[PDB]
Structures are given as C-alpha cells and as structure tokens.
Design a protein around this ligand. Structure first.
Ligand SMILES: Nc1nc2c(ncn2[C@@H]2O[C@H](COP(=O)(O)OP(=O)(O)NP(=O)(O)O)[C@@H](O)[C@H]2O)c(=O)[nH]1
Ligand SMILES: Nc1ncnc2c1ncn2[C@@H]1O[C@H](COP(=O)(O)OP(=O)(O)OP(=O)(O)O)[C@@H](O)[C@H]1O
Ligand SMILES: [Mg+2]
Ligand SMILES: [Mg+2]
Ligand SMILES: [Mg+2]
Lengths: 352, 51, 101, 80, 208, 97
C-alpha cells in the first residue's frame, strides 16, 4: 500500500505525505462531518467502508497558516478557489478535521447556495418584519451543529436574555444548548436561534474561551442573487433573509480568536456561467469588497504523482473491474478523458 | 433604476442628438413615429401601384 | 380601361387615401397619446370617423397590375404567380431562373 | 457615485477602509501607539496591495493577478 | 447515401494492423494491399478504438434513446452499470466467507449474461394456409433472438406498472433478476417457449 | 480553453483521443486548435480530422496508411438534406389520405 499513510492525525501531515490517503475514523466522520462531505463521496465511503482522503498542497498550505495563526489579531479569511471538481470542498473538510481534533468550535455551513433557492415555507419574521425566515433550512443545520459541538453546548453560556415569546424566554447564564434545542423542537424560532448562536460564539471567542472556525462552503451565494419570490412574484434580495444576513457578520474580520475558511462553488450557483471559477466573477464586486483583504488559495487538478495514487486506491479496493484498467494503456485514457480531474476521473471509474 | 448623475446625463445626450427630453410613456412615442416616417398612403408604392 | 371594376374601385380608394393622408395623420396623433384630455380625444374620434370610408388605408388591396388578382400576388413585381411565371418561364425577367439545389 | 465611475480608484474606497481598520486592530493587539493614517499608507507594502486591487478591478482577472494580490496581503497580515 | 459504393466500411480494430507481416497469410496479406486502393468511410462518432468499447452496451443505448438524445440514453446506461456495481458490493460485504466466491461484481459480465438468459430459441411466425393465419413455431436467427432480448428488457422497464421508479433502478433490478434466471423477461421467454411447443403440430405449414 | 472544459461530454473527448490512441502516442504532443461553426459533435469531428492530418507528419508512412484505413483522414460528406416543397421533410412525405 504505497497510496496510504499510517499517520491518521491531521496535525502531523507534511510535504512527504502528499499523494497518500489518510483514514478518517467512523466516530470522527459522524461527529465532524454529519452534512459536510460531498454527496458523491459518501457513496465511496459507503461502498469502500472507509473514508480515506488525500493529503494535497492546498490543505497542507492552509494547515500551515492555522498553526502559526495569532489568536490576538483579527480573523484571517482564507478562500479556496479552483476549477470545477478540483477538491476544494474536500480540502476544506481536511481543515475541519484538523481543528475539530484540537477542540475548536466548528461553525460549518456545508452549502450556502441552498438558502437562496427552492424554499417552500418562507415565513415572515417576527423579530424584524422586513426579513424572511427559513425554518426548515435552519433547523436541519442546528441538529448537525449540535452533533459536532455537543460538548461545548454546556460550557458555553449566553450573556443576554433572549425572548422567544412572552411565555417562554431564555435567561442569562443558561447553556447555549437550550437555544439550539428551542430551535429544533419548535422549527419556527430556529432562524432566530441561529442568529443568537453566531452572535454569542463570535463575541465569546474574542474573550478567549474557545477558538472558532467559520467553514462556509459556497460563499459566493451570500452576495449574489436569489430565485426566491414574494407573494407578489417579486425577486427577493439576499440581505432580506435573516439567515443570510447574520452569516455575513461572521465573515467580517472584526473579531479575533478564530479563522475563516471558505470555498467558492459554481455548482449550485445562481446566474453564473459554468466556466466561471475566479473569485471576482463568482463573488462579484459586493463579495470581493466585503472579503477583501482575503488570502486566495488555488486548487488544481491531480498532478502525475497524485493521479497514480488515486488509481491505486481504486485498484486496492477492487473498484476498477474492467480488465484493461490496471494496464499502462488504460491509465492513459483515464488521464486524457479526465485531464487528471478528480471528479471526471471518479465519475469515469464508477462504471468501469 | 438609474443614478441622478446617469439620469441627468442621459437627458443631456437627448438634447444634443435631438431626442425626447421630457419623460414620455410608450403610448405617446408613436407621435414621434407617425411624423418621423411617411404614411403608407403617401408612399409611391401605394398610390402608384397600378400603371 | 382597367381589368375590371374591382381594380377600378381600388384605384379610387388609393386616390382618396392620398388626399386625406395628412389630415388623418394629424387627427390620429391627438388620439395616440396619454397627454391631451379625453374631451379633446373624444372629439377627434368623431372627426376621423366622419371622413369617407375610402380614405382609410385598410381598404386598399394589393391586386395584380395585369389581371387584378387579389391573392397570390408578389409585392416586388406586383404580379400574380401566374403572370410572374409566364414572364419568368420565357426568360423575360432579368435574373429570374428556376432553382435547383 | 462609485457605480458611475468607469475606472476604479483606490483612494476613498472599501479596500482602503478595510485594510486600514484591519491594520489598527493589529496595533492594538501589539499594544502600540503607531496609529497614523499617513504613515501606514506610506509603507511599500500598502503600495503593492493597492496596485493589485486596481489591476483586478480594471484589467482582466487572471491567475497571475490573484497570486500577486495574495502575496501583498500576506505581508500586511504577517502571514509568513 | 452520400457515399458511393466504392467506399468501404472502416475497421477500428487496433490489434489487427499491428499483426506482424510474418503472421499475415497469403490471403490476408493480399487484402491489406487491396484496401490501400479502396476508399474508406469516415468512422462514425459512436465507435472509437478505446479498450472499454462494448458493441452490445452501445447497441442497447441506441435502442433506448428517444429523439436523438444520446447524452441521456448513455447516462441511464452508466447509472445502471453503477447501480449494479454498488448493489453487488453491498451483497458482498454482508455475505459469508464462502458465499463471496459466487458473487459477480462486474456489471458488464452481468449485462451480457442476463441478455443471454433471455434469448429465445424458437419463435412464432404467422403463416397463411387455407385462408387462415397460424402461429407456427419457426427457428429465430441469432440476430433476432439477440434483438428480442434487448427489446423485451426495455419494454418491461418502460411498462407503466412501476409508478415512480427511475430507469437506472428499474433496469438494474431486472438485469439482476435475469442473471439468476428470474423475472418477467425470462417468464416472457418461457411463455413463447410454451406456445411454440404446444403448437408444434403446425410445424409443417412453413416451407423454408 | 482546455479541451475538457470546452468539451464536457465524454464522447467528444473520446473523438479527440482516437487519433493519438491509434498511433499509440498519447501524452507526446501539444495541440492548439480553433474550431468555428457547427455544434457540439460537429466541432469534435472537425478537430479529429485536423489533428489526424497534422499528426501524419510525425509518424511513419506505414502508420499514415493505417490511419487512412481507419477512417481518420477522410472528410465525412454527410450533410443535412434539403426539404422539398411538397413534403413534410427531406424524405418524409405528408400523410396520405
Ligand atoms: N427571537 C429573538 N431573536 C433574537 C433576540 N435577540 C437577538 N436575536 C437574534 O439575534 C440576531 C442578532 O441580534 P442583534 O445583535 O440585536 O442584531 P440585529 O437586531 O439584527 N440588528 P442589525 O441587523 O442592524 O445588526 C437578531 O437578528 C435575531 O436573529 C431576541 O430577543 N429574540
Ligand atoms: N483530497 C481528495 N481525496 C480524495 N478524493 C478527492 C480529493 N479531492 C477531490 N477528490 C475527488 O473529487 C470529487 C469532487 O471533489 P469536490 O467535491 O471537492 O470538488 P469541488 O472542487 O467541490 O467541485 P465543485 O466546484 O463542483 O463543488 C470527490 O468526490 C472525490 O471523489
Ligand atoms: Mg464543492
Ligand atoms: Mg387604440
Ligand atoms: Mg423530422
């Protein structure tokens, strides 16, 4: 097994592990990645009965910044950009697994394009009547956020009195867990509970209690357009949504004690061309201005070394059954058809 | 959905190139199209159709 | 000495449409707007409807100039398909040939 | 307004305000009294950071201009 | 046809040309020189010289396509191959140590064998004798039975009995049932075999 | 634009590979083409034929004859057929009453 690495702890990966897959344990997979992993990578975990992720330079470069990150300075925004199917989402997961092991607080937005499209029950808010709430989409996230950070939900305590209703309110000094549970049980104050969670975590982080990781995949949704419509069939702007308005506050570098890692994505985007992958094109003027200053990190296609170890992980699990696959001439066609592209290569090998 | 600078600039261009200056709707712009073209009946293909 | 009375009627129609072209244009201009009062537009609706019917251009018919055929007419030559082909089949229409491709 | 300008100007812009506020929180973390606008802009690092934003906004955006802009932000934020 | 009779069909086989001149027989050697003089048609888009090219999986894709939408017909075929592949891996991890030796995981070997288990041997052809049509048993040719196997599988899946099931899940389920000699497509072959063996008394009406 | 980006459909990429795979020299040349007109599948075929013709200068005479016998150097003459005045289509006829 030249494609696997025995070091399954992401705090010790380096340049000598590049190209080798490391093993994410089942306990960490359910806890760390309830909703993060791509939908077509969970078929591989379910079929291979193991989640093995490659160590590449994008994540190694980004792990080297989060180790030497000063927690006194304001949070630094890191942006992963690349062509379609290049692994930026999976690279982000690599960093979420590095920070979860070090008792960070993981604020993981697995796909932010889902909040700006195909919303059936778009209730008007009660805390502010100019904003709309998304109860079905905020309560699905709280259940996963609770799973990842179950331990901290009791240590962390709120510093204000949040009134859900005249009858029911949460008093200063409770556990944050109560806020989360309120939003999961009622599925109508959830959108307001999410806003409280973001506000408390951001404020407390600066104090120094816990390190915060804001992992937002598909971050070009926040400053784009929506396909949601009002009762009068008028387009809704993204800042009218209460869930999308509170998430822009976490992206601003007005707090310290944490890092902001995000990843662009044209898959699921609105009113963007297929070949658009650069930050300005996807983010736009509004997005670039808000994020600026930010550190963009490029994710590219498999290089020759990384391409061979991807095919040795598929051949070591007997996932390439066609008798010409393992030969030297069969790999030249896979390399050509995919041009060393993880998704195109992984989509062409699924039916061999 | 235009800025004051852009809107006023457009008005300025409409005065130099001899366009409409006041805000007029689409129904009232046919008057510009009725007097800017020759009517069908005065065209030479109409009244000199036959030998 | 026109082909038939149907042709002769159109000739008058086209002559009366040329005399009232301007008068009708000036009166419609008032009607075709949202600026002038309805009171004035209602008076112009009665003035343009009192003019002879033959001044209306929608009564003009593009017939053939040789056989006065109302349908099957080509506007560029003002001829019917039957008269056009006759001259085209004898090589009398410059540039006109049969198409094969 | 800015929407009417057909050419991006760094002066009095969001980029100049964002990087200027970011550099003031960095001084407070280091407990320093060097809080002068003119001095910060004078630095060469700022000159390279404003030349990259004015090239991304005006000129064609390519992978070479996103890497030149990245190096200018790693010196201001001390991200060696 | 825009091609003349002179034009001959091309040979995409890549291992044929490589054959050494020493192996070339006198008849074969002659052919190779003759082809030089002949004009050759342009290879169509459907078939390439890849190592994964399967003529049976390309013909089955063309028999499902509707209105020239080959991107969707090919998409359904690959999803079906991946569904057969994923369903056998799920039946292989949950099987006993000695049951894993008899579990096929190659979707192609399943596709070709399932279609071979549906090929009928004899068919019924209506023959006019004495002013009446008799469904007399006639031996189907090799191509006919290969075509009927594909047509029946696509008709069964298209049949509107499954209310809301996607073709990849339907075609994959029928291919795994025919692999084990089960299902309606196999039953449809038996019903044609039971009617050709009951009406064998009229096996002399035919002449050819 | 990189070919995989320009040609998303695999079939189109397969056509591009065909010439090089046949002469067993994949990953040995750099191609820069510019196709104009037609549609998705018409552009690949036009590039295949151009690459194949330009790849005959870097192969032996015997290999060029094999390419010819494989249909890689012939221009497909199949083009759309015209519609006739009295029919629904090029060859389809209106329903006979
Ligand atoms: N239901 C409820 N939600 C609250 C309450 N206090 C805060 N929130 C949630 O927390 C979010 C942030 O609150 P706050 O800091 O006051 O920000 P804001 O009211 O939105 N003002 P702005 O949008 O201008 O920054 C609010 O949008 C709402 O979602 C409360 O008492 N009840
Ligand atoms: N580091 C890696 N280890 C293992 N597989 C990978 C890795 N990177 C990419 N892949 C393969 O590529 C596929 C797609 O990767 P990913 O979902 O990260 O693409 P993406 O960059 O997010 O694309 P999009 O822009 O469409 O979201 C994965 O399902 C996986 O099979
Ligand atoms: Mg992604
Ligand atoms: Mg009217
Ligand atoms: Mg047709």
């Amino acid at each position: 097994a030249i494609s696997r690495t025995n070091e399954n702890d992401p705090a010790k990966h380096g340049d000598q592990h590049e190209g080798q897959h490391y093993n994410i344990s089942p306990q960490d997979l359910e806890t760390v990645f309830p909703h993060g992993l791509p939908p077509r990578f969970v078929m591989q975990v379910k079929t291979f009965s193991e989640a093995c992720l490659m160590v590449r330079k994008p994540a190694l470069e980004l792990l080297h910044y989060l180790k030497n990150t000063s927690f006194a300075y304001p949070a630094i925004r890191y942006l992963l950009y690349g062509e379609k199917g290049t692994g930026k989402t999976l690279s982000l997961c690599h960093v979420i697994h590095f920070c979860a092991k070090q008792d960070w607080l993981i604020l993981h937005i697995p796909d932010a394009h889902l909040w700006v499209k195909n919303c059936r029950d778009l209730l008007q808010s009660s805390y502010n009547k100019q904003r709309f709430d998304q109860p079905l989409e905020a309560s699905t996230w709280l259940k996963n956020f609770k799973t990842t950070n179950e331990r901290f939900l009791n240590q962390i305590k709120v510093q204000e009195k949040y009134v859900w209703n005249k009858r029911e309110s949460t008093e200063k000094g409770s556990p944050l867990g109560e806020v989360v549970e309120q939003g999961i049980t009622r599925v109508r104050n959830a959108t307001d509970a999410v806003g409280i969670v973001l506000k408390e975590l951001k404020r407390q982080s600066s104090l120094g209690m816990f390190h915060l990781l804001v992992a937002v995949d598909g971050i070009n949704a926040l400053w784009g357009r929506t396909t949601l419509k009002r009762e009068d069939k008028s387009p809704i702007a993204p800042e009218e949504l209460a869930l999308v308005h509170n998430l822009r506050k976490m992206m601003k570098n007005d707090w310290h004690g944490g890092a902001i890692v995000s990843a662009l994505s044209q898959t699921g985007s609105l009113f963007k061309p297929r070949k658009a992958y650069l930050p300005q094109e996807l983010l736009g003027k509004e997005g670039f201005d808000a994020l600026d200053p930010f550190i963009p990190i490029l994710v590219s296609n498999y290089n020759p070394k990384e391409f061979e170890s991807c095919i040795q992980y598929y051949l070591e699990n007997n996932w390439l059954q066609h008798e010409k696959a393992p030969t030297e001439e069969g790999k030249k066609e896979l390399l050509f058809l995919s041009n060393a592209n993880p998704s195109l290569l992984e989509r062409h090998c699924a039916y061999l | 959905s235009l800025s004051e600078y852009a809107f006023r600039m457009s008005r300025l261009s409409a005065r130099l190139f001899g366009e409409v200056t006041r805000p007029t709707n689409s129904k009232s712009m046919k008057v510009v199209k009725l007097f800017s073209e020759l009517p069908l009946a005065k065209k030479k293909e109409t009244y000199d159709w036959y030998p | 000495h026109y082909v038939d009375w149907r042709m002769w009627r159109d000739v008058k129609r086209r002559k009366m449409a040329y005399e009232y072209a301007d008068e009708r244009l000036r009166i419609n201009s008032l009607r075709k707007n949202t600026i002038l009062p309805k009171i004035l537009q209602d008076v112009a609706d009665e003035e343009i409807a009192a003019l002879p019917r033959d001044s209306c251009p929608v009564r003009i018919r593009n017939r053939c100039v040789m056989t006065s055929r109302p349908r099957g007419v080509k506007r560029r030559w003002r001829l019917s398909r039957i008269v056009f082909r006759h001259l085209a089949d004898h090589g009398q229409l410059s540039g006109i040939q049969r198409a094969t491709w | 307004t800015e929407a009417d300008m057909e050419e991006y100007i760094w002066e009095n812009s969001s980029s100049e305000r964002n990087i200027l506020e970011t550099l003031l929180q960095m001084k407070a973390a280091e407990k320093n009294m060097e809080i002068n606008k003119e001095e910060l802009l004078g630095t060469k690092e700022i000159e390279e950071y404003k030349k990259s934003v004015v090239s991304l906004k005006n000129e064609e955006e390519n992978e070479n201009s996103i890497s030149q802009y990245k190096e200018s932000v790693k010196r201001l934020l001390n991200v060696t | 046809s825009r091609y003349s009779p002179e034009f001959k069909d091309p040979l995409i086989d890549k291992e044929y040309y490589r054959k050494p001149v020493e192996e070339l027989t006198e008849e074969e050697k002659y052919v190779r020189e003759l082809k030089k003089t002949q004009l050759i048609k342009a290879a169509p888009a459907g078939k390439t010289s890849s190592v994964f090219e399967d003529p049976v999986i390309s013909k089955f894709t063309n028999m499902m396509m509707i209105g020239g939408n080959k991107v969707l017909a090919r998409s359904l075929m690959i999803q079906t191959l991946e569904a057969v592949k994923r369903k056998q891996f799920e039946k292989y991890h949950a099987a006993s140590a000695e049951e894993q030796a008899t579990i096929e995981r190659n979707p192609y070997t399943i596709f070709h064998q399932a279609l071979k288990n549906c090929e009928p041997m004899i068919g019924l052809v209506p023959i006019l004798k004495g002013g009446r049509f008799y469904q007399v048993p006639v031996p189907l040719p090799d191509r006919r039975r290969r075509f009927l196997a594909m047509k029946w599988m696509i008709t069964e899946c298209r049949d509107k009995k499954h209310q809301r099931t996607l073709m990849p899940e339907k075609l994959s389920h029928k291919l795994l049932e025919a692999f084990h000699n089960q299902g309606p497509v196999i039953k449809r072959k038996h019903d044609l075999h039971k009617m050709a063996e009951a009406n064998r008394a009229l096996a002399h009406y035919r002449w050819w | 634009i990189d070919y995989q980006l320009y040609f998303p459909i695999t079939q189109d990429r397969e056509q591009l590979m065909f010439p090089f795979h046949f002469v067993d020299r994949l990953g040995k040349h750099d191609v820069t083409c510019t196709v104009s007109g037609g549609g998705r599948s018409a552009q690949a075929g036009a590039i295949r034929l151009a690459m194949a013709k330009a790849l005959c200068s870097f192969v032996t005479e015997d290999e060029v004859e094999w390419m010819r016998q494989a249909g890689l150097l012939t221009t497909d003459p199949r083009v759309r057929e015209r519609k006739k005045p009295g029919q629904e289509g090029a060859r389809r006829k209106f329903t006979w009453k």
